[PDB]
Amino acid sequence: LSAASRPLCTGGHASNKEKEMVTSLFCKLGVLVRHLGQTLDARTVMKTGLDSVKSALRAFLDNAAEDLEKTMENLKQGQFTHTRSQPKGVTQIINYTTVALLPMLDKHNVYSIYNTRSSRERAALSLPANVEDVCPNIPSLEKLMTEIIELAESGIRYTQMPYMMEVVLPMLCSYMSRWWEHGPENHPERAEMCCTALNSEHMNTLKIIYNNLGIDEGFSQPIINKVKPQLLKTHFLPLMEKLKKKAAMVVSEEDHLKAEARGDMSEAELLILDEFTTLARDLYAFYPLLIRFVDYNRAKWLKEPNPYWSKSHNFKREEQNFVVQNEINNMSFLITDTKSKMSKAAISDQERKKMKRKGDRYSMQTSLIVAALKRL
Amino acid sequence: PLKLLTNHYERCWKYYCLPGGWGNFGAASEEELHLSRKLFWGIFDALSQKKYEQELFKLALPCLSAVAGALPPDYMESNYVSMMEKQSSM
Helix, strand or coil, X not given: CCCCCCCCCHHHHHHHHHHHHHHHHHHHHHHHHCCCCHHHHHHHHHHHHHCCCCCHHHHCCCCCHHHHHHXXXXXXXXXXXXXXXXXXXXXXXXXXXXXXXXXXXXXXXXXCHHHHHHHHHCCCCCHHHHCCCCCCCCCCCCCCCCHHHHHHHHHCCCCCCCCCCCCCCCCHHHHHHHCHHHCCCCCCCCCCCCHHHCCCCCCCCCCCHHHHCHHHHCCCCCCCCCHHHHHHXXXXXXXXXXXXXCCCCCCCCHHXXXXXXXXXXXXXXXXXXXXXXXXXXXXXXXXXXXXXCCCCCCCCCCCCCCCCHHHHHHHHHHHHHHHHHHHHHHHHHHCCCCCHHHHHHHHHHHHHHHHHHHHHHHHHHHHHHHHHHHHC | CCCCXXXXXXXXXXXXXXXXXXXHHHHHCCCCCCXXXXXHHHHHHHHCCCCCCCCCCCCHHHHHHHHHXXXXXXXXXXXXXXXXXXXXXX
16 A cells, blocks of 8 residues: 555654644634634644754655655745734744755745745845835834844755756846845945844856846856856955955954855855855955954954965964963953953953954864964 | 652653553543643653654554644643644654
């Protein structure tokens, strides 16, 4: 007997019955949301579906071939349905597990629900260009909020492999790709806790030759011909390399926006074009040396930049001077220690945070390189 | 306590003759006074699976009885956590 999901397979039962019941229940009751046990079972199935299996990648890893595709599609469609409402049930963090279920990209030809969610996100895709009261969901308090930034950052993150369609790269994706690149200033609106929370997502095809062949493409995708993205994605690297200043606290977001597309994070043509791995990475590594080492720029503005033989000695010497300044500070604190609550404790915290971030960025790959060079 | 602790003292495989009655009572009702009947499953969700990645088939029917009995129980707002994470680690 064919041990199908609903027929026999118990591993498929918990996915099939749960996802079918959700798609039957809350997809129907969403009209009941907008104006005894409906709310209770709703808040039940919310977190029973968001965390049916905490190992979301382990659930749909090799349990069934086609069931993972249908169930991830139905789950993301159910997420796209109720994304606009502003209810009390929070799932902005719980969407990260569902997003991580995708790369750990299947055949999306069975249905275009991902295209539906992408087109709903295309309402206000270009964030700073379209930031207004007509923002995503057209909200004042409904969906326009702080969670959408982290949702775009972590939830839109497919590091395994880009086996999707990517057919709207010249029109849909290029809209938020180009309106962002309309100027050097990012231009975020008020309540800008962080403008870099969109994502470290941009790469080479993942004005331009593909959109230039609008009738021809709209199948010569822009990812096929890598020269057209390689021209105008890399042209802006010298613009940011030129823009700088002596004062460090002025340019806070200068390193962040360049470090994503510049270095080896751009897997598209990293091994094809050696400039993306070599020269842009050298510039994006050398710029923080002049940027962060000044004491004017604080750690809170450039706290978490999670992402070379030449700049190694420069970092070592400048950090030696920085630790010498910290040691002179410690010798000052030992002699007549003033009120530590005012400026000394915060100064030690800032120095320790900067030194710890520098040591962690060394420990990513530069610590082993330093050990090998010291042995050499 | 003497139902909670005597199980998780010595032995690994003893919970087959007992919880037929627990499945019968999960089919019977979900009484908020008898929330300990849910808490034994709520601690078995982690401590019953000792090492060796065993079956899910028997434990489906209590979960389906809880699915059928999602509608009746209200006024047990705190007790909802116990019926959730049984199938996650199993």
